[PDB]
Design a protein around this ligand. Structure first.
Ligand SMILES: CC[C@@H](CO)NCCN[C@@H](CC)CO
Ligand SMILES: [Ca+2]
Lengths: 1034, 49
């Protein structure tokens, strides 16, 4: 109550609003970086892979006598004079630049289309002084400076050139490669300015504007509080009343949250966000790493920098997901201490409301919010927005309304799914009008509405603290043009994915969404039928229902329609659980006909939930019951629950036609007390189902790896993840067994071989990432030496006769210097028991008798080379000599079999082979299971060349690799041209027949290509500056 | 081809395609029927009738 607090509020609020409007347009400081190619004055290939795929400018100028060492005798395999891609790549011709020599003409192919050409003896003339070339976003142009055309289609005497316009013909650069070796001549200057438009930094003026704007916003809200305390009333607390205490229900919810934090399924996007947050410190900005050309997360993701600071202690999965655990605890304590005692007296004194609020909270939290996504932030922000607004209405004060505006604008920019907070923002307009219209008669309009504007615009200092306005606008338009962006009428796709048979449409997610819709419909029907739900307050009940409906309507304007975007309803679900429990009791709903119909509806949506699989994501699915089939004991849970639903309808019809009630009949029993809360029983039954299913998944694979076993190992060191339980053989030529009779040639097909193909495999289908010891000419996988490994086969191009193969006797090693596996490699499509092992002792093989038989098992895509494996625990400890055996059961020419000799591999773990220092190309799924391995960096538009690659399993790799491909951005558009892959044998340490994924080596085409060095500078740019358009690959 | 009772979402998934099954006329008819039914149910709940 002072005039000074009425002047300070106006002045500070207007200054904060002006400094917030001004700050996206203030200058920055770009770091300019260009590539001048001849580094030390010699012909040497360099390696500079650009992340935006193209430079904003390119200029090469080759003299005449540079190409003197390009033609001569027939000892010249030297084709290219200059390139921006390695010529050995399959896609090198239709993506980059070449000044390659076709047989007698020196031509430069740019983006698959020729630009200029000339005969080579005319280039080596004393004319043709240059080979000027230039590339831009509108035209490319080449020119032989010195000569003209001859007797051809063009008239001679026109000074030969070539231009291509009307399309973006800029070449992709992954380095500058060549095929010469001498000292470089004069001239010969390639130059390219790299697009480092996001490598900015604030200037002094922008930094002072951000500091002064935040200070003025704080001073304006302090003056707003001094105005609000004019009526004589003091503080006396901040928190609710029963905050520092525990009950049994709080202990139960806390125990379920902690145990799900350890043995719990994770979401899909955790390695994505962890890899982004790990590389963003060296990059200097927050780039989206797997897609869209290195464009940043432009207004969204203010908290990824907090995750990047949080990850300096350790990158373990129990450490990185600990703020999400704290958000879940805070969310339930806000629900039970602030919302439920606010919704009335019948909601506050009843216990069934508390139990079903806890149940719907856990049923939304557990399948949907165990990760690094922005979903818990948005859920807790919607609750805190509603609680601040609801406290502003009661005490009739404006400062909690301004705090709610700050929190709502803060959670609006967590992710694109944060648009659900506009429900809690739009419901808070009527209350704000009611509060402002009461105070305006003694303070005014400016003094009450300038801190509201300052608090509304304080978030622009957080969005635009690193980027400019032009960068974020053009990047958002470009991401909408390139990537997957569905419109508002494609909202049915989210609900079509909810009803699939996949991890998107599993039991838990489907149950959560259908139970939310049921509780919302019952609350709306009881609000329409009576005036309100009877024992509850009017305003808060209305505002809960309105916020939930506007959240459902606002969720259709998101660019992607996924199923894990329903995790924003985890705070509203406890509130609707309390309302839908009060709306069902005998005090509110008086007829038992209606209560039996509601119980039947609960049973019907529970029946509809179990009509799918118990499927979870990538490695959360190991060992889980019913993870690939419908849950059933003998019939199916869905048919049993449908029968119970029909029986409940028949009981309701008998209640209808008999004309009977309950109030002088059933006072209280124990099952009658259990029966009146259908939502509590259904929600806690599904919560116990989920928790017990992942605990049993952890128990079924105990010596093998599981998610929960790694999270419980992490309490005692061992924070590497899956990298300790994957065995890797580097050299696949090491543990070959030795035969007893003839040497290592024909000893594969020693004693019986009819239909044996030493070159009898199809050369076209059998392919994986001369002369042989068997006379073979086939390609061997996994780095097998053709001079030591014989190959047989069972394929032919004529009429097919049956084939029987029977090997020689192979000596077995000692039982301490032997690995856990016996491996043969095999190609072709065949059945389970086609290839077998036949072990014997010394005297059993001297008598030529079987002695035993085990069968190989297989993991792999057929018909390509794969590894067949069998443990040595299946071979009894008295066996000394083994022998292979094979037979093809007809099935026409397409069916076949290929075979190599037996091998006991010498295995090391993946943490010892792939260390913690080499750059690894991780996929966007394999990020939280491999936390010790580091991804590759990028600093000024140039990326670091990886050495390894880790993939998911085959079903997961063939459906998720189009995120990272060439058509969307992606680092698989760079390594597709620069590097060649090579598979490595890898086995899961105790669950040998499981497809965990795969590992690859990445080898350069030119091994003598050093990294480049860039010439750095500093330029002061403005807030609307833009160097060049963003080229989209189409 | 015989789908079960829990495959009832497939009829609406076909209604929201871009094909002669999900054309303008059929989609308008079904959505207008659902709108009129919801308004009738809401007015029957709110008042007596
Ligand atoms: C195609 C993969 C999807 C989800 O499955 N990832 C969504 C993108 N992740 C966002 C941040 C988690 C970045 O835009
Ligand atoms: Ca055959």
């Amino acid at each position: 109550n002072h005039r000074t607090a009425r002047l300070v509020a106006i002045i500070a609020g207007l200054l904060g609003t002006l400094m917030a409007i001004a700050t996206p347009l203030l200058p920055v400081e770009q770091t300019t970086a260009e590539l001048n190619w001849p580094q030390n004055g010699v012909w040497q290939s360099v390696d500079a892979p650009l992340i935006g795929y193209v430079a904003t400018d390119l200029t090469v100028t080759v003299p005449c006598q540079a190409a003197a060492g390009l033609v001569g005798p027939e000892n010249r395999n030297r084709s290219v004079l200059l390139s921006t891609v390695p010529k050995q790549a399959p896609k090198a011709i239709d993506r980059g630049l070449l000044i390659e020599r076709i047989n007698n003409d020196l031509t430069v192919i740019v983006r698959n289309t020729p630009v200029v050409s000339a005969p080579l003896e005319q280039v080596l003339s004393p004319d043709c002084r240059y080979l000027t070339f230039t590339a831009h976003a509108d035209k490319v142009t080449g020119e032989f400076v010195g000569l003209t055309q001859g007797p051809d289609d063009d008239d001679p005497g026109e000074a030969v050139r070539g231009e291509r316009s009307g399309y973006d013909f800029r070449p992709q650069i992954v380095g500058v490669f060549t095929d010469l070796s001498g000292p470089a001549p004069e001239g010969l200057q390639l130059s390219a300015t790299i697009d480092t438009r996001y490598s900015t930094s604030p200037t002094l003026l922008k930094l002072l504007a951000m500091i002064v704007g935040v200070a003025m916003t704080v001073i304006a809200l302090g003056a707003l509080h001094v105005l609000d305390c004019a009526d004589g009333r003091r503080h006396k607390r901040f928190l609710p009343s029963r905050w520092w205490s525990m009950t049994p229900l709080d202990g139960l919810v806390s125990a379920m949250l902690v145990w799900w934090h350890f043995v719990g399924a994770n979401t899909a996007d955790d390695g994505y966000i962890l890899t982004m947050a790990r590389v963003s410190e060296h990059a200097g900005y927050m780039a989206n790493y797997y897609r869209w050309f290195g464009t940043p997360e432009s207004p969204f993701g203010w908290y990824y920098d907090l995750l990047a600071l949080w990850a300096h202690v350790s990158t373990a999965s129990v450490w990185m997901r600990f703020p999400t655990l704290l958000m879940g605890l805070a969310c339930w304590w806000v629900i039970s201490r602030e919302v439920i005692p606010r919704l009335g007296a019948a909601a506050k004194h009843s216990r069934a409301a508390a139990w079903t609020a806890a149940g719907l909270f856990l049923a939304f939290w557990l399948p949907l919010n165990n990760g690094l996504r922005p979903e818990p932030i948005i859920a807790l922000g919607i609750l805190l927005t509603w609680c601040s607004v609801e406290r502003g209405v009661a005490t009739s004060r404006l400062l909690p309304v301004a705090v709610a505006i700050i929190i709502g604008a803060l959670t609006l920019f967590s992710g694109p799914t944060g648009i659900a907070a506009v429900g809690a923002l739009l419901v808070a307009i009527g209350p704000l009008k009611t509060i402002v219209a009461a105070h305006v008669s003694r303070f005014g309009y400016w003094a009450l509405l300038a801190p509201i504007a300052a608090a509304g615009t304080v978030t622009i200092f957080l969005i635009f603290r690193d980027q400019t306005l032009a960068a974020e606008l053009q990047a958002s338009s470009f991401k909408s043009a390139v990537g997957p962006s569905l419109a508002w009428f494609d909202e049915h796709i989210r609900y079509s994915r909810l009803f699939t048979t996949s991890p998107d449409g599993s039991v838990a997610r489907r149950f959560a969404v259908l139970t939310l819709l049921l509780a919302l419909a019952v609350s709306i029907a009881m609000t329409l039928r009576k005036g309100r739900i009877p024992g509850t307050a009017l305003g808060p009940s209305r505002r809960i229902i309105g916020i939930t409906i506007i959240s459902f309507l606002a969720m259709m304007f998101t660019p992607t329609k996924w199923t894990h975007h329903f995790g924003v309803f985890a705070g509203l679900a406890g509130c609707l659980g309390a309302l839908a429990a009060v709306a069902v009791t005998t005090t509110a709903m008086k007829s038992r006909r209606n209560r039996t119909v509601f119980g039947a509806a609960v049973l019907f949506v529970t029946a509809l939930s179990f009509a799918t699989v118990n499927g979870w994501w990538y490695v959360s699915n190991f060992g889980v019951p019913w993870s690939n089939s419908f849950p059933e004991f003998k019939f199916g849970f869905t048919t049993m629950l449908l029968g119970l639903s029909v029986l409940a309808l028949l009981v309701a019809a008998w209640f209808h036609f008999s004309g009977r009630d309950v109030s002088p009949d059933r006072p209280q029993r124990r099952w009658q007390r259990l029966l009146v809360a259908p939502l509590a029983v259904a929600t806690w039954a599904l919560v116990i189902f989920e928790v017990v299913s992942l605990t049993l998944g952890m128990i079924n694979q105990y010596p093998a790896w599981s998610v929960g076993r790694s999270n419980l190992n992490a309490l005692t060191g061992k924070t590497c993840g899956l990298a300790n339980d994957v065995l890797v053989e580097q050299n696949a030529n090491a543990g070959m067994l030795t035969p007893i009779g003839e040497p290592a040639g024909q000893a594969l097909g020693a004693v019986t071989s009819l239909g044996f193909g030493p070159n009898g495999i199809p050369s076209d289908v059998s392919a994986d990432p001369a002369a042989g010891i068997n006379g073979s000419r086939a390609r061997l996988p996994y780095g097998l030496n053709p001079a030591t490994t014989p190959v047989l086969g069972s394929w032919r191009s004529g009429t097919q006769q049956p084939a029987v193969l029977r090997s020689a006797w192979y000596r077995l090693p000692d039982r301490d210097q032997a690995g856990p596996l016996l491996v043969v490699s095999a190609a072709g499509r065949f059945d389970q028991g086609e290839v077998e092992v036949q072990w014997a002792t010394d005297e059993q093989a001297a008598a030529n008798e079987p002695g035993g038989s085990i069968t190989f098992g297989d993991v792999g895509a057929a018909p390509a080379w794969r590894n067949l494996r069998a443990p040595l625990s299946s071979i009894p400890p008295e066996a000394t000599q083994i022998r292979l055996v094979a037979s093809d059961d007809d099935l026409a020419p397409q069916h076949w079999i290929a075979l190599t000799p037996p091998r006991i591999p010498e295995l090391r773990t993946l943490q010892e082979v792939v260390g913690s220092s080499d750059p690894v190309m991780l996929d966007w799924l394999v990020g939280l299971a491999f936390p010790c391995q580091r991804p590759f960096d990028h600093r000024y538009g140039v990326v670091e060349v990886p050495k390894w690659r880790i993939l998911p399993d085959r079903f997961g790799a063939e459906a998720n690799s189009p995120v990272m491909d060439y058509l969307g951005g992606g680092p698989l558009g760079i390594t597709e041209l620069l590097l060649r892959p090579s598979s490595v044998p890898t086995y899961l340490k105790d669950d040998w027949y499981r497809d965990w994924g795969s590992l690859q080596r990445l080898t350069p085409w030119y091994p003598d290509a050093q990294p480049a060095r860039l010439d750095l500078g500093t330029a002061t740019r403005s807030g609307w500056w833009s160097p060049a358009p963003l080229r989209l690959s189409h």
